[model samples]
Target: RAKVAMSHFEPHEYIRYDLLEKNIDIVRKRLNRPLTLSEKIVYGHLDDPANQEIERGKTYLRLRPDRVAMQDATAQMAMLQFISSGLPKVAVPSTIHCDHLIEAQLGGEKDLRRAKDINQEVYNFLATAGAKYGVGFWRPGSGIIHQIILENYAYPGVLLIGTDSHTPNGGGLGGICIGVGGADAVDVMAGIPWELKCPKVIGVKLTGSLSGWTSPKDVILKVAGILTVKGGTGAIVEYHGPGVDSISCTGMATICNMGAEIGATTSVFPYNHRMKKYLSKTGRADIANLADEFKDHLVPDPGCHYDQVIEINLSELKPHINGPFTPDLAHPVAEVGSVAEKEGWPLDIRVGLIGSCTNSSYEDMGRSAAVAKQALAHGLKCKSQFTITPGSEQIRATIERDGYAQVLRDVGGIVLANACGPCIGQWDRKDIKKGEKNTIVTSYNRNFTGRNDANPETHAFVTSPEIVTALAIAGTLKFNPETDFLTGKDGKKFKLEAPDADELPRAEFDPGQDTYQHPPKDSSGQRVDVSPTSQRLQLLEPFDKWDGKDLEDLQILIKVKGKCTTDHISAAGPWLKFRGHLDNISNNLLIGAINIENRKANSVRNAVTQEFGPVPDTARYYKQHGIRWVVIGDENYGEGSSREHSALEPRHLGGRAIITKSFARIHETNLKKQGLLPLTFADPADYNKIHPVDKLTIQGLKDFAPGKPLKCIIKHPNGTQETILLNHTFNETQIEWFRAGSALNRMKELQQK
Candidate 1:
């Protein structure tokens, strides 16, 4: 069945088995030693026909992933970009999931109905686009992108990319999955080279076993404490060592799903017994057999060299709840009360959300149910509002059949659809007093400020579903199930016992239906016609080509103060509604970016009009005046979700270049793909040289080439000028994207019209 599924891509030649095998052999030989599973997967996908020397942190190369997948929030623009390239159909097997649009206020059916009604035009546009372009479209309420991929598509050793950062969730089955932007997705779907910087490797050895209440979530939580949010930047974290096999496949995925929190390129575990068992349990025995045949190639060599190595003893690992605001702010469950009281964090927990790409597994559900059952038995009611979002229809149906859903419901927990829900700021969190300080806990991967419900004042924490459930029953982040006692209806003090659960489904995995929608095989003549006056979606207009000259006297629209994440640049929540329409979406551009000049977020000075306004308003003024601008920033710029809207919006608002001390890998690539210049200062201290009132000129572009740095001339309001060196990661192909206006324009130039 796996072979047949792969063969389906051969007619379109999407998988490129010949190239994969060839690259695998070449990489094996090039290494001059045994290859790690991650090395094989990474090297196997290289676009180098003639194998080249791989460099860490510097070398850039194109890759051919087996497939491309997208969630609805990012898919809209990606599909629009692909169709604008003049391609009638995707050149690879691709899918679009409608999971990010629906909020979790009501139950699945009600939320889905509301989503369909609210986003009818967007949904219709996507359905029509999928039918017209031979792309599979998963209807709203189907499942989250990562879970859907895991269920029907992800296979060991195959490389795939999705637009959502949590796309790495596929690693549970030993797939090399990475998150990327819509522009990169469109490029890969158009059969163009998708570029990546040669990533450094971080070797993580898992030694002890996960026992008792110390579930897989603790592993990542501990690692997050060690790596912080930016420690994994420019690296791929490969988990090996004997402890790699200690956890279930789904648990391994839970760890990888949070890799994005540490800013890693992606995370993976070797193909082992756990993967095989999961494949069989998921009804993909054929794939399991195939993986078994190539099992030797699925792990790293004993002496494999890595840039860094860390060993973790899982048995000694205590349960951790990360964040009151950041995922890396780790707090041991036992210490949370002291820590919260010491830090004056709001102890009144208002909500507990379980399930996302991170912890919506069957195991996660069963374990969380154990705690819920105890709550019912002890006559303890849920103190906070609680909700569970199953990862997919398969897991949802299976858990419901096995009574986990019932256990949760008896405690006043709502079961949300198999969608992203609260994880992506789609939660219609009721009764959030404006600017009120409160606390919430979830099993989701991210807990960035405003991430859960767009309320920065709401303190959010990340933990396992069982811990989240226990905390909900206690209605406080301070409660530790291991030590704290709860008062029951009988006026008796009862302590919750350690949670236990099956690693997989206890019964036969029933392959439920209504979880997927397959695209039509014959869609050559399908037409997607949207009303010309529709505000929900507007067809794209190609960006203007770069004139053969250097950019000069560009205004400094905004010098971002610090931590300019993708969420800060393109924000989610309310802005998500305009994702399908570029012009409408551009209004929210940099609305969350901190302004360096005034130390205020989202406010910028329009140099041309001498007016202080929102970032987008200022940029709009510049764009309307035919003036180009540049953005300056601090380290790790664009460090959040792989949302291309960040780059696209800036470009739409006439941002020609962004100069920062450093950049997040994916965001830098996105800027390049969209023909926007992403530059770094040669001298870190040079960042302080430019002011918001400064006019900038970036020269040496016509001669832009690999290994060449550009020159930036900053002219201050006082008529003083200073030159700084700028570095970029653009390869020859990406340089063409600059010359041709955008990657899509370059692809369109080669279209077979």
Candidate 2:
């Protein structure tokens, strides 16, 4: 079963068959093909490439699945600055793992015992100063979902960093997955190689056969609904497919775990034989032979050339969803119940979820227990509210040893126990309003709009678990299971039920005994217990300038709408145990946005609105005096998560750049990783043409130039340099992690081993 095809003059698998038979004898004189000893031992040495050994300070790059994956108020201040920035001096390949603090739609089992007591109270305070210089613990439930535990136990050609942002879910299992910030995950967990400005891929391709209740999460919600959540801003999406071998490897890791819900910078796919049956079902059968591992470090060229290209046919994917406030607003659940009944949102679906980890694998619980055993043999009765969480604990004992966990608990469903409860809404979520209703049908992977429970008023439906258990026991979202009448528990009714998902039983992954093991002890390796709910943090020490022309700058209002997300300034939800009680997380900031309650009622009914942030609105608008703010947007300026505290809370609040015309792809690379400055508008037709108190100025920032354009001034407070065009959109390791203000203080001052 290996005749193979695509070679186009020499792609013959990234080439090496004796260097394509002594540098192209035209595939042996035009196609008679004579380069084989397995393509001459894979073209002898494929003459160098890993970005052609960029030797600036010596081959360094830490990109592993990070399009955005930080959680819990900046992953506990990037585990308190990789345990106070001495990140053991940049080594390469350390693993912090935060799996975005729990919220699988906030449903039950007391939010998986408050997500294992808040992931063991923030890795017990990041292991009390990270086991004094010996850190590498690996937390979060062990079926490992930090982008499938960095594609089954992180290891790739060199760098592989993490801290959520779907850690590019380990670029669909190969690595170089980048999603920076928690000070760039404590500057790559103190082994600093965290630099930026290296992305440019975007390929995407994919191909056929996903149809009928389509999957790979409806081909990445139809490419995040046609790349709308800010079209691959910082770049790198990759994929490629015979429909990427038609799904598995956790359905191409639920389509590279929503490459950080739209603002991708990572999301991979090519590694083959569904990655040797996902490294022989996870125990890595000793690096499941990729022709003897790294023997050719995964596939690429079939004329591989990208900067942009987006095929996607998976038989015209359907079943998609991305609404009520963009994950790029996807469609078809018949236009999501008529775009939630013509935007009147009365479909009513109170917490009726399925599971997370993108369609809870194990063949999505045998296709959601064959759609809850055909709605409990058509006696369907789930009005008692629904719930399901099958992603691991050996997929909750292999879905109750394969009975589909009593057919989703005999119909009314509630089997949960693989953690990631209520899909990262941290449970206790709500909605039923805007004239009453209830709905929360999830299958994991972003639904975002008041993110599930912060109440973007219910009526959320992202199907497939037998069409969300036949629309949760038929209480109506206008039932359909391919046309029908369903209701039981004695209301007497039944009809043409479905249940065939190719006759089930194919989920056989063991990745080494479906772990939860406890043998192999010697944990006196303990020194990390900082939880009095931990404190001593609040810092900002190292800085260079910001005198702010003698104080005077006040007005800081403009918030939420069009684009402003790091989940709108620090929030990981289930109301993040009202985090460090900072005015209960700054009045749950921007909650149910009424333009954030009229910009918190014009900064508490204006009185010079002084430092209104509970704290860190870029360090309380730069300690209340050094102010000069203006960031009003409407067409994609810092849209959604890649949380560099949404550009370090507007550059610690004294704000320097974000005049938005368009920007989204890791908060415009977290506003150049936080030296801010993303200036766009030589006309996307002059973006909103200018308004919010109208004064704006940044006049030739000491001359500008890394990408070029400057001198801008829009007078109202005596302004005049009026020339707008600065787009130096950084990437040289994000200009040294933003002139070293972060990437954990640029790994305590570079020298990455």
Candidate 3:
């Protein structure tokens, strides 16, 4: 009989344990040392393990990931780039998920209907493209990308890459999953090696057990507090210890989903009984049994070393709520009220959102509903508006079937579509006016300014779903569910009991609506359609190759003040509709970045016109006049999600280089992929020496090489010049990418040859 399929749709695809073990043994013999769980999985997927160097945090590894996943927003550009290569089919199993584009408005049914009507053309393009390219397509209302992958495709020891920041959620199942830009996803889909710097492993040892109000979300919240969003920049966090067995697989997924907040490449847990049980629950018993045979390879060997080790005793860990604007501003639930008061934040909770890709597992929903049920018994209801976003159709149906949805609904929870919705700022919120100072809470991972409802003044906090529910009922941030008492309709005071729920549904998981579209057996005859006049879809053109000379006379586009994240570089809220149209989406480029010259956003000086205007308009004027520009940014620049648009927008608008104090790891690679120079000041203090109106010239490009510092000449209006050295991270292969214009261009050239 044939081997078990990976999922319901792909019958031929199977986990290649035989090949994976062969590669692992090859790496093991070469290294002659014990390896961490992360090292084993990463090294096992090496494109050429026999010859690839094995230095952590130094050598770049060319990896061959097993699968590729793309969301609707990023998939548009990736599919377009793949189409430009003139390839008929993808090299690996790839999927397109429609989850990020739907907006949360009235409720699930109505909002989904409206999204289907509004996003019909965009959906048509993705569906047809998948059909033509032999890729799987999950329709609108199907589920969020990461959640669906965990339910169907994710398995132990698999290496997968996706175009969303939360792809690490698969690590809960022992997969080496990573989030990358659309360009990187395109490279993997085209059968090219995906390159990454070997990440040093940071070991997190958990001891004791979880109880009371503390949950798995608290673990990541605490880690975020310890790591401070930048500490895990070039590392992978590996969780192991006796405490690991106590957490559910979905709970572990909750922790891994938010790993992006700490800037980790990803986070993983050692294979355990929880993972095996989850695989069996999700109709992957064969894979689970197979994993049992390779159990020794699924965990870190004894005496293995970690770059850093942090020990946390789960029994003493307290519930944590992080944010107001950042995910790392963590505070214990008992003390957050005082912090809010001290910070002059509004304490009245206006909304409580539960569920998203981050916390929408069956266990999360069940526990949240348990709290809601307790509140209902005490004659209490949500004083603040409450919303729920199930991560996938299977979870949605199962929760509804299990009466958890009914309990939540009875306590005044409105169910939204199984998409990102408010978590990604697709929320059509009307309760609060613009510029109004208010507070809200969610169980989602990110709480960046203007991320949920596009209101910068809204104070959003991240916590567990159970805490979110209790806070919603209390309608205030000051109420500590662990200690505070609530007065019922009968004027009797009562305290909520700690929530309890099963790890998995007792009954079989419901597949819900059939929203998945399987590609035809012979997809060669299928036609991929995109109207020439369409505003939501556009074909891609390769960028021009680099000229063999130094870059000179580049005007400064904008000197960013502080904390310039990817969301600030390429905004999401309204611009998400224009993701497929490069020219249209480029209009929102750098609009959210604060200009250091005037301490304002969007307004920047145009040297040619001698007038202030929008950042994109100024950039367009420079591009129109054939004047190339560069952006001066603060430390940890591009520190947000894995959107390639952060780099693509600058390149599209005729930007030649980005000089920053530092860069987040993924965004730096994205800049290199797009053939833009990502440079950093050799002396960080040199950033203050340059003015907004200064003209800059980048020297030593002709002889660019690894570990070499280039010189930058800054010329003021008075014609006085100051020279400073700049640093770069371009390897030999990446230099070729810059020479060929882009990684995609180099891939096309190789295919032709």
Write candidate 3's Cα lDDT for 348-384 as tens digits.
9999999888899999999999999989998889999
List lDDT for all candidates, in order: 0.84, 0.53, 0.91
TM-score of each: 0.96, 0.34, 0.99
- Candidate of highest TM-score: 3
Clashes of each: 2, 58, 0
lDDT of 2 by residue, 1-753 (tens): 222211111112221222323422332243343332211212222232223332212233333221223334455555545555644432332334334455444433555556767566554554443344433333444433553454345322213445556666655555445556566655544433445444556777887877556666777878887877667765667777577777776667667777667776667776677666665555454444533444343465345457678898888766655665556677676556666777776565554676666667666677767766666666665763778776655556656776777777787777655556556565654334443444566666666655656565454656555567666766556455555666566677666345445322356643323322121123424454443433323334444343333212323345335555556555456545543233334433333322432454224222245334343333343447554664545556555555554555455545655655667655665566556566676565544445444455666554344556665555444453244454555546655554565444555565462
Q: Which ten residues in a row are the worst by lDDT in model 3? A: 1-10
Candidate number that wins on TM-score, 1 or 2:
1
lDDT of 1 by residue, 1-753 (tens): 123344222343333334555787887676677666677788888878466667777777578788899888999899888878777778878888999888878887788888889999888888888878888887887777887788778878888999988888888788889999998888788887777788888989999788878999999999999998899998888898878888998899999989998889889998899888888787777667766766666677778888899899988999999988678999899998889999999997899999888898888999999999998997876999999998888888888888888999999899997888888888887778767889998998777778788887888989999999999999987788998889888889988889998878868765556645566776547677767777777789999888999999988888888777888888888778889888898988888777878888776776665668888888888788898888899998988799998888888989999999998888988898888999999998998888777788999998999889999998887888999899887788889989989988888777653
What ranking of all candidate models by TM-score puts the best one first?
3, 1, 2
Question: Which one wins on lDDT?
Answer: 3
**Pairs of residues clashing in candidate 1:** 36-300, 37-299
Better of 1 and 2 by lDDT: 1
